[PDB]
Amino acid sequence: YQTNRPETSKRLFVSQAVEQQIAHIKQLLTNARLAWMFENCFPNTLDTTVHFDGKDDTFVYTGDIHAMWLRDSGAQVWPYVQLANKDAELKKMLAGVIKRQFKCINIDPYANAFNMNSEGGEWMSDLTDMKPELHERKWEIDSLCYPIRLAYHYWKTTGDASIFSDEWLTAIAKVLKTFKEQQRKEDPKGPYRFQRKTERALDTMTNDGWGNPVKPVGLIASAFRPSDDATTFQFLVPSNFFAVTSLRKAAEILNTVNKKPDLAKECTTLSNEVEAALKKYAVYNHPKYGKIYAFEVDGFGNQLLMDDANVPSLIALPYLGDVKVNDPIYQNTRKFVWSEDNPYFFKGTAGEGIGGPHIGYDMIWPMSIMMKAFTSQNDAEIKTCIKMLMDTDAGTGFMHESFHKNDPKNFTRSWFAWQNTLFGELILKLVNEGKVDLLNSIQ
Amino acid sequence: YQTNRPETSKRLFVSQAVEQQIAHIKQLLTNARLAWMFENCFPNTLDTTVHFDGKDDTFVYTGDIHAMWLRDSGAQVWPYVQLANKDAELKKMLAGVIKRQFKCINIDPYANAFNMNSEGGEWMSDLTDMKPELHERKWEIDSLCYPIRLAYHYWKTTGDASIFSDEWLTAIAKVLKTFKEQQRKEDPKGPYRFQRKTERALDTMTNDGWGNPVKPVGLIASAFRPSDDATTFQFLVPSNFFAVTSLRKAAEILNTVNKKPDLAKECTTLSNEVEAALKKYAVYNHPKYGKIYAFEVDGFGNQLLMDDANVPSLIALPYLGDVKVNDPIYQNTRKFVWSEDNPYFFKGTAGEGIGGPHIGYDMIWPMSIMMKAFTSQNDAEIKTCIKMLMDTDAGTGFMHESFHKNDPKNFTRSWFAWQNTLFGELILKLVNEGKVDLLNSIQ
Ligand SMILES: [Cl-]
Ligand SMILES: [Cl-]
Ligand SMILES: [Cl-]
Ligand SMILES: [Cl-]
């Protein structure tokens, strides 16, 4: 099992703590293919996408899409944070990612994807207010949450509050401004409008670039989902849940570190407003499953019942920490989304799981199977998930965006560093929780 | 009030019976403005869009979109049928419209819009199987229903069954085939795929050209609506209702005229399947309004609650004859759609009514107001609607596609012959029902 990592000399960033963690997990695992896949995937972000300048900046590419997503970058380095106290260079690089993220938010808090400098690119032609520092300007609530999540974990783990600079203060004020704009209370249209001349229906917005109507009940409108597909009803439930938790983290930072209580209070009160509106509008009494969370709602009474593989998703709510895994409405939702009552759940000869309209019919995303494992309370279920992930990689040793339910050799995104990070993180979690016997029972 | 009709020498088709009807209504009406609008609108189709070859063919343009829609053409000559027994040339022309519609269906039963010959046009580059005889190929269930409706009413009025030729037999077989393909039972994708590179989200289809998934519960998928906007969930309820009725008319024709009892039974069997599925899936228990009809459903349990102005619409069900006007679920739906609980209902300084995502926020379609009048059981409501139509035409004396809720001078489609026909039809209906005194009470 020769590694599919790049040759040592070609790896973009090296962490001694990451290398020792990998050596350790390989030693513990008896399944040689699993160990090989772990080694391929866990460090892929560092091997292939990290540009650390040695000082205060880290730019992080997604993989086979050559720009930096706020979402991807916040996830791509997530499991490394727990190693930061053992590795000074790793710690500096992580602080650089967070500092870069806040600078990106400051450039445009509506934008999902950024260039390293001012290169422009193919989406300068989009019918929206573009700057050459942007790769793409799809408004996605979760773009602003992932950096807050990363920064909070980095701070709690390391005690290093120096990331909460004047650029952070500018950024978090932009986050509040943007979230409140997108409650669309005074104007159904507003400051964010997006169209693109494209054949892909979900890469442009309905109603002349304004999206489908919302009734302004307190939820935050998201123009696009974490899949980068346009929302159908703009009050995207998983992303609103993620906003609640992220604003509360922000409030704690603002009170404790910055002594900026007015901004903290604005975060707290907005979080409570969004949470109250989720309780009032995001629940659907399903005749089969009982009370479940809707995927998207419009505030008029429409509720879209589905899930999409991309995190934040319904199945992943407890992974991000937005609900407790025991939440009865979550457990009902979990049963619903992993069934043929979900329009984007697919089952065939090669496996089963959730995809979405991004790639279309019958294309299962490994992320959904990973999130089923992350949120499982049952060993047999976790084992089934891990074996499926091993048996649906087309022998590449990496995580893909999606694969066909009847043929894993038909797959999308060969080099998707967020997904590789998630797989490494999953295996590490399971080993650290004392479940190496379960993994070693895979023959 | 000088007429806005063309001068006599520029009128494309002249009917003696239509002129007699106009002169009769003008003499009965005492409101000069209303009489003027009637005269402008009722014959607009004949005046400006009809090309009858004197034999067996009539081509009918929409107005300011220079192609023939199966929907528009089937409605544009509808109110003239009742005059056909007294005007041989009008009769011949109507039979020519029908014959042309069956010819169109035989060219491509998935296509909405046709050229007179092989001119091609802007949409030849669409990502679908195009032919130069097509102006557009957006699959809309109602495209196949409007011709059957016209044909049945022409047959019942005139007794002329000569229109039900071998070309009809081919055509109705294609209708059955197409409807059944679009139940999507054995293949969730199927023979019809459509994308277009466009900034307009609803002018292309999701999921790589297949649209959003449907669970094959027996309903018929419509890729697009009568607005020409893509469906959100493909089992479009008003169109499925229209299909049931249209299939039963076709069964009657096939039994009585063509002596084809097996093909007739195939129509009836399908009608019964769609009807059963509408009962099981199309009803939503609205907490404010009671049981209502959903606008679109996917068969998985998703139901979209709204209405769009274009007929077939929810408000128009009794106009087309698909439900009785005192169906309790219909009456509940009627209250819901004409309310701010409908995302596409707008109220402003100029009036109120229903639009849709075709033209977008705040744009009300006169068709919705007309349909409210057509389906009204109250003289005062009827009078209010007629007054609103008169007060929202920007002084043009014609019916428009849409007008801004706060300013009727901001309007779309100055020359829209379907809409002009509907207005004439409405006024004629009210006079023929004995309600001229109501019309003459408008000051
Ligand atoms: Cl649009
Ligand atoms: Cl509060
Ligand atoms: Cl095993
Ligand atoms: Cl009056």
Short mmCIF file of C-alpha atoms in Angstrom, two decimals, chain A residues 127 184 188-189 195-202 204-207 210-213 215 232-234 284 286 298 300-305 340-344 356-357 359-362, chain B residues 127 184 188-189 195-202 204-208 210-215 232-234 284 286 298 300-305 340-344 356-357 360-361:
data_model
loop_
_atom_site.label_atom_id
_atom_site.label_comp_id
_atom_site.label_asym_id
_atom_site.label_seq_id
_atom_site.Cartn_x
_atom_site.Cartn_y
_atom_site.Cartn_z
CA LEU A 127 -24.56 40.01 -12.37
CA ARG A 184 -35.19 41.33 4.92
CA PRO A 188 -38.05 42.29 0.29
CA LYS A 189 -35.15 42.98 -2.09
CA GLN A 195 -27.80 36.46 -11.31
CA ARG A 196 -25.49 34.54 -13.62
CA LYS A 197 -25.99 33.62 -17.26
CA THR A 198 -25.77 29.85 -16.88
CA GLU A 199 -27.46 26.60 -17.90
CA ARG A 200 -27.49 25.50 -14.25
CA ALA A 201 -30.78 26.59 -12.70
CA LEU A 202 -29.39 26.80 -9.16
CA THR A 204 -28.68 32.01 -10.54
CA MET A 205 -31.54 33.47 -8.43
CA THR A 206 -35.23 33.65 -9.25
CA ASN A 207 -37.40 36.77 -9.31
CA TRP A 210 -33.91 38.51 -5.49
CA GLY A 211 -34.84 34.85 -4.89
CA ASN A 212 -38.23 33.46 -3.85
CA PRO A 213 -40.18 35.71 -1.49
CA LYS A 215 -42.01 36.81 5.03
CA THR A 232 -35.58 27.21 -2.88
CA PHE A 233 -36.99 28.93 0.26
CA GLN A 234 -34.37 31.27 1.64
CA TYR A 284 -43.04 20.00 10.47
CA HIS A 286 -44.53 14.43 9.50
CA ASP A 298 -40.14 30.89 3.55
CA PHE A 300 -45.33 32.12 4.62
CA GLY A 301 -45.90 28.52 5.67
CA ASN A 302 -43.96 26.69 2.96
CA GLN A 303 -41.55 24.07 4.26
CA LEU A 304 -39.25 21.97 2.07
CA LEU A 305 -38.69 18.47 3.45
CA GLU A 340 -36.69 7.28 0.26
CA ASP A 341 -39.06 9.96 1.62
CA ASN A 342 -36.13 12.37 1.13
CA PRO A 343 -35.96 13.38 -2.59
CA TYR A 344 -32.17 13.48 -2.39
CA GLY A 356 -28.60 16.92 -3.66
CA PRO A 357 -29.39 18.91 -6.80
CA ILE A 359 -24.67 16.97 -9.06
CA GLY A 360 -28.16 15.54 -9.44
CA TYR A 361 -29.90 12.22 -9.40
CA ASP A 362 -28.30 9.08 -7.98
CA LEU B 127 -29.96 22.30 -24.70
CA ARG B 184 -41.80 8.88 -14.71
CA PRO B 188 -36.98 9.06 -13.19
CA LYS B 189 -35.26 10.98 -16.00
CA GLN B 195 -31.51 23.41 -20.20
CA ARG B 196 -30.88 26.91 -21.52
CA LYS B 197 -27.95 29.27 -20.79
CA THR B 198 -29.81 32.19 -19.25
CA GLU B 199 -29.68 34.57 -16.31
CA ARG B 200 -33.36 33.59 -15.58
CA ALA B 201 -33.44 30.72 -13.11
CA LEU B 202 -36.84 29.49 -14.20
CA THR B 204 -33.74 26.28 -17.32
CA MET B 205 -34.18 23.06 -15.27
CA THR B 206 -32.41 21.78 -12.16
CA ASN B 207 -30.62 18.46 -11.76
CA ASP B 208 -28.76 18.57 -15.08
CA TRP B 210 -34.24 16.60 -15.44
CA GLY B 211 -35.88 18.89 -12.89
CA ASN B 212 -36.49 18.18 -9.23
CA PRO B 213 -37.14 14.50 -8.35
CA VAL B 214 -40.67 13.14 -8.33
CA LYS B 215 -41.86 9.96 -6.62
CA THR B 232 -40.44 23.73 -8.48
CA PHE B 233 -42.15 20.39 -7.83
CA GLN B 234 -43.15 18.84 -11.12
CA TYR B 284 -52.96 20.45 2.35
CA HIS B 286 -53.94 24.83 6.11
CA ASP B 298 -43.42 16.13 -5.74
CA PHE B 300 -42.49 12.64 -1.65
CA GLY B 301 -44.69 14.80 0.61
CA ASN B 302 -43.52 18.26 -0.49
CA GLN B 303 -46.34 20.68 -1.28
CA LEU B 304 -45.85 24.23 -2.53
CA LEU B 305 -48.57 26.63 -1.32
CA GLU B 340 -50.88 37.75 1.75
CA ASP B 341 -50.31 34.11 2.77
CA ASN B 342 -49.70 33.51 -0.97
CA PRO B 343 -46.11 34.61 -1.78
CA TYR B 344 -47.21 35.83 -5.24
CA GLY B 356 -45.76 34.94 -10.06
CA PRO B 357 -42.01 34.63 -10.48
CA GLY B 360 -41.32 38.96 -10.23
CA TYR B 361 -42.16 40.98 -7.18
#
